[PDB]
Ligand binder design. Structure first.
Ligand SMILES: */C=C/C1=C(C)C(=O)N/C1=C\C1=NC(=C\c2[nH]c(/C=C3/NC(=O)C(C=C)=C3C)c(C)c2CCC(=O)O)/C(CCC(=O)O)=C1C
Ligand SMILES: */C=C\C1=C(C)C(=O)N/C1=C\C1=NC(=C\c2[nH]c(/C=C3\NC(=O)C(C=C)=C3C)c(C)c2CCC(=O)O)/C(CCC(=O)O)=C1C
Lengths: 739, 739
């Protein structure tokens, strides 16, 4: 920036303060080439003639008594006929630089300075907070320097700083709680202050002392004074101080690590000068303060992050505990809002967005959801001034001041949204930030602000800035728990509803079968009616036989259709508790399956007749037929047979049949392949088989389910004792029935 | 060797090191009550003869001049004819103790006070964590004082000592990693170290100087010396140092909120002296170190807890994705252990125990799991020592010294538990560097192999205490991982049986349509054979017609079955292409639905003649019938008329019909209520009706799905344009079919 401020060079102005004396040396010869003009008082010779001559006779002889140890160390206190002076040496631009300053006069303060500086570390420090540290540091600085006003200036990320602590004298004007514009500190000053910890300005009204010669012959520019301590500041800042009304200034820099955290500023109303040892004490004070501040801020950040993680966890615990995703989220919307300190939570799981708290209206929320897809961000996005970037939503910015968005899915429209409310803030400036300076004709300079009276700027459509902890919480919300639980909850809900539609379709199919089953009955009645009753004689023998075959085929088809309707259909399957001979039903089932038994080489074994029990004959016959079909379907042994019997009251029974102490336990045993004992309860399920569907001469697996349902409806249960290559025995328990 | 060690007092030894001088005063007149034996050299008078003598006479007038200043400040440097002599003053027990020590010969202008503070503090600009803080502090202290060895000791929970950081001169043995029992530093020593922050032993070989009189006349005990800094040392510690071969000692205490935390010890092989400025700087150094340590420990604990919480992140992310809990444990066996910092994880989820890392044998694990059940604990159990409580595992405590268990099932014996070995194999050996020295003392006091052996016996079969962070992490695991895995297993079983139910429903539909095609394969055959049964006019025409009617009914029944084959599934039939006129299909549909149109007062409108398209006649007729039924179902207007038209290639058509760029688009328009544009696609779903199922004379919601499926199978798509109270128009696009 080549504008009045940044364009002005520093550390090359060549201005020297009044009281100092400056000398330069180079090479082993150590001659004089850069000397100030105010040395005539000390040296007693024309400084212009003193340039280049033998230094061995220029400076007073008393200095050479400790010259070597001063060069070894860098600081020296020496008595002169004019008075006791302080001397420092430093190598700048490849040349030795010597300074002479009016030294201190009271030799009784240096020891007390240790006691004074001990007050910052203190028996008590930080027990009440960082504010205590700052105010104690300011008070100690003020007591040490003897100045009037001492303030602490903390820089911001935008390089416009504030003041935190303050120490005052009676009658002065305080500057607590004001914001100064970032233009007050140019880049050159920030660059310089990373290397020179402190500086002093004794007299604002004093004209800077020129340096002779004007420029260095081998450089063409005045010698750098960055490492020195007597450089005069640019007159623009002098005018700034004069307009402020102060007289003398003295500042130190707080370095966190290569970064200017802040300054310690001191002002005065009269000319005043400080000793070297006092400045060293203040430097040590700043060192200690910087150490403590860095440690405390690190601890605070770590504690905040740990607290946010330990708040993230319980959300996962609570979500896992519950079983109603939307309702569980609603009943603890405060927790998710506090997760990042927001007021509106919005969830996008591919369906209707979920809204909690102060949230934008629906139209706005899918307007935003449509957006943020064109905007490229790798994982997440966040902003405070949404209305500026998004004019459409700037209208109702009260509930949509600022936002944060996280890509819930890896790459989709599933986004999590946090909305902040409008926060009203006002800030004070010592002067008008809009006009940091007044231009002058020629644009060679920009005069500083004429006044620094309080001016109020009120911001609108703003919310507190996002903290790093908020970003960490959002990132830990995207994945690393909480994300897994809500992803799986959404999958669970959106597929459980699909399964609900699935059994709804199953019920619809059942109702369709129920209302269509009236057609086979009507067709069978029509086929039976008007035939074989009036035209039976006219049909002849062959006609009557063909009609009988047709009627038998129709009846068989109707019976098969009725049996296939094993579901609920129009009427749920039930049992009629009646005195029906179980032996007769078993014999009828065997006669019906006699052809299958002969084809499968299965012999019906009846060691004893099944006792009669109070149960439906049709249901008992169906259960027996299903059990026989299941036993003979997976029968591979050459000796295939089915043994049917029953254990009554007190009759011996195997362990599996003895599980239920029913009055009657009908057992059918076959020496087939059988099923695994774990699969014995599995085969009883609907359409469950231990072999391939197309194997064992085809199968459906619904017979075992029908038998189990019949047993359950009869007050008992069906248990199959089956072992690998050891045969199978299915026992069904018959209860007393309804009473 | 003396057992009277932890009880013997250090205050009342009545001894002062060789170089110092001590006087005691009492009363307003400041009489003499306690003096040392070195007063003869510095005063030139008999020691005991000065007791009870007036203060002004005995003490030289030089320190009398500064006596009030000495009382005010507390310390003062004063030159005496013999030489410089620093004076200290403090009130011990109602007796004012004055302290004279030989000040160093330096003229105090080499490295004055408050200057060493900067030298010590400057290298502490970094010090990211806590260990490097102590390391750098020890290094810079050894650089400043120049002592041979510097060590840092940290105290354990029960005052066990551990060497943390060592900064040593090259040449001697290193003691980094030591461990000594609490008995090596008695209670009185700890109290003294807490009280004052400095301790210095100038010479180990110096004989202590006695105190005359041997006891105070009044209190009956030797004068207190805790407040002072020249009290003698116990002979046992002198023997300790002599065996160690250490001459002078310098120790700085470390505090934390008033509780002792560690020590900084300095050892030298020869007597040495320290300037008082260095000591006065070291005091401030200790204060600053305590202030730093508090925040550093807080931040370290917070960061450790945060990392423990975040470790659940990747572990949870391992779940959810395809894998088993045991599988994740097997590959992530590494990450699990540092969740509690153990060497072995065991868990009993319901099957055989799972063991990862270092753990006892499986049978012992099962026995321990059985033994845990009687012990009453709600959720968490944990011991640092197991042999004291579990005798069976006491012998093999080397790998199972301590344990931490948490139950998984609320009531059942499902628990997960981490094992930690004894705190003697974890610690790296440091105590016995071999090369034993030539002297061989009793070595019960000699640290080499003397200590670190009692400590081994004191802590054998014991694990480091379960830190609160580890317990919190274990609780978080038990909560979150179980609350995730339970619903993960629920999801697994749920979609398993959902897929099973869907495929079983499809297979049952296929089997049922097979059965309901085989049944009419006999029914229609019987109906046809009934005609040939008569084979003559004997049956008569009318009766024969009845048979014909039955045949038609049979055919109708078959048609119904065919309808079922096209009802539940999308098409359940192979696609075909044929030259079937769309106008003929529309006319046939209108004629079939003529009764329905007359009953519902529906008028068939034909704005244009439907051309001929390459599509199946049956499929086109079914699609048209479904569209007409859907249009007439939701028709509530008085002038309810259905208009059927066709748009060819390049002809004007509605935008919805223009979605599919097909040659022909057949559109059916009705003035009924229609469906919402969002519900236009939802209505196309099978069994999806926007109104009540029983409303509008019943409904199924499968005709639109069938039409959409036919359109999709015909190389096109089916669209519906409808708005609330704006009619509806269903357009089906017909493609060119296969090439
Ligand atoms: C009968 C009691 C004691 C036995 C036990 C013993 O060995 N020392 C006993 C009393 C005191 N020890 C004091 C100082 C001290 N001792 C240790 C022990 C150590 N453990 C180690 O590993 C090492 C080094 C290898 C040592 C030296 C320490 C660490 C200390 C403090 C360090 C120091 O001040 O030098 C003591 C106080 C003496 C005093 O007045 O200063 C007593 C009493
Ligand atoms: C481009 C012109 C210009 C405008 C006017 C302006 O505000 N500053 C400026 C140029 C320079 N000012 C320099 C020095 C300087 N300014 C400040 C500002 C403050 N004084 C306070 O009391 C205070 C509060 C707290 C603030 C923010 C300060 C602190 C300085 C440093 C000098 C002091 O120690 O006071 C400057 C660099 C010259 C130099 O410092 O050597 C330029 C170029």
């Amino acid at each position: 920036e080549l504008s009045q401020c940044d364009r002005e060079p520093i550390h090359l102005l060549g201005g020297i303060q009044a009281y100092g004396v400056l000398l330069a040396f180079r090479g082993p010869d150590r001659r004089l080439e850069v000397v100030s003009a105010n040395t005539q008082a000390l040296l007693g010779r024309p400084p212009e003639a003193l340039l280049g001559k033998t230094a061995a006779q220029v400076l007073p002889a008393e200095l050479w008594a400790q010259w070597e140890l001063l060069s070894a160390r860098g600081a020296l206190r020496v008595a002169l006929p004019s008075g006791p002076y302080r001397a420092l040496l430093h190598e700048s631009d490849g040349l030795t630089v010597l300074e002479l300053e009016p030294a201190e006069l009271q030799p009784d303060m240096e020891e007390t300075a240790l006691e004074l500086v001990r007050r910052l570390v203190s028996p008590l420090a930080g027990a009440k907070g960082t504010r205590e540290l700052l105010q104690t540091a300011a008070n100690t600085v003020r007591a040490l320097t003897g100045f009037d006003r001492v303030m602490v200036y903390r820089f911001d990320a935008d390089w416009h700083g504030e003041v935190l602590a303050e120490s005052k004298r009676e009658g002065m004007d305080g500057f607590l709680g004001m914001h100064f514009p970032a233009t007050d500190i140019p880049v050159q000053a920030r660059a310089l202050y990373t290397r020179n910890p402190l500086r002093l300005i004794a007299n604002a009204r004093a004209r800077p002392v020129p340096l002779v010669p004007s420029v260095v012959p081998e450089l063409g520019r005045p010698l750098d004074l960055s490492g020195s301590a007597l450089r005069s500041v640019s007159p623009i800042h002098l005018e700034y101080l004069r307009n402020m009304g102060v007289e003398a200034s003295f500042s130190l820099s707080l370095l966190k690590d290569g970064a200017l955290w802040g300054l310690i500023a001191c002002h005065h109303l009269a000319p005043l000068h400080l000793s070297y040892e006092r400045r060293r004490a203040c430097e040590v004070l700043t060192q200690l303060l910087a150490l403590q501040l860095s440690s405390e801020e690190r601890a605070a950040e770590a504690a905040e992050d740990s607290h946010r993680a330990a708040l993230l966890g319980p959300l996962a615990t609570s979500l896992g505990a519950g079983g109603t995703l939307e309702e569980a989220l609603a009943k603890d919307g405060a927790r998710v809002l506090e997760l990042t300190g927001a007021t509106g939570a919005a969830l996008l799981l591919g369906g209707e967005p979920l809204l909690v708290g102060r949230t934008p209206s629906m139209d706005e929320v899918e307007a935003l959801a449509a957006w943020l897809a064109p905007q490229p961000f790798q994982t997440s996005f966040h902003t405070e001034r949404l209305g500026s970037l998004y004019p459409p939503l700037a209208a109702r910015a009260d509930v949509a001041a600022g936002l944060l968005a996280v890509r819930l899915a890896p790459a989709s429209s599933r986004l999590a949204l946090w909305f902040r409310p409008e926060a009203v803030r006002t800030i004070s400036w010592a002067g008008n930030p809009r006009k940091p300076a007044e231009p002058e004709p020629g644009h060679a300079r920009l005069h500083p602000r004429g006044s620094f009276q309080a001016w109020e700027e009120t911001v609108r459509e703003t919310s507190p800035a996002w903290k790093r902890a908020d970003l960490a919480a959002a990132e830990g919300f995207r994945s690393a728990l909480i994300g897994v639980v809500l992803r799986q909850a959404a999958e669970l809900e959106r597929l459980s509803e699909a399964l609900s539609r699935s059994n709804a379709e199953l019920d619809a199919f059942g109702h369709t079968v129920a209302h269509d089953l009236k057609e086979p009955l009507r067709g069978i009645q029509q086929y039976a009616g008007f035939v074989m009753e009036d035209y039976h004689g006219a049909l002849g023998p062959e006609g009557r036989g063909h009609m009988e075959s047709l009627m038998w085929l129709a009846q068989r088809s109707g019976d098969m259709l009725d049996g296939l309707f094993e579901y609920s259909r129009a009427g749920r399957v039930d049992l009629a508790w009646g005195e029906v001979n179980m032996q007769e039903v078993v014999d009828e089932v065997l006669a019906t399956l006699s052809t299958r038994f002969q084809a499968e080489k299965l012999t019906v074994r009846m060691p004893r007749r099944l006792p009669t029990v109070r149960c439906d004959g049709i249901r008992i016959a169906q259960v027996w037929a299903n059990l026989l079909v299941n036993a003979a379907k997976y029968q591979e042994g050459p000796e295939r047979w089915v043994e049917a019997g029953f254990h009554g009251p007190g009759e011996p029974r195997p362990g599996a049949a003895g599980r239920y102490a029913s009055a009657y336990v009908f057992y059918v045993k076959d020496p087939g392949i059988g099923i695994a004992p774990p699969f014995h309860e599995a085969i009883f399920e609907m359409f469950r088989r231990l072999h391939s569907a197309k194997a064992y001469g085809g199968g459906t697996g619904v017979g075992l389910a029908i038998a189990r349902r019949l047993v359950q409806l009869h007050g008992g249960a069906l248990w199959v004792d089956s072992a690998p290559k050891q045969g199978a025995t299915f026992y069904f328990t018959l209860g007393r029935g309804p009473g």
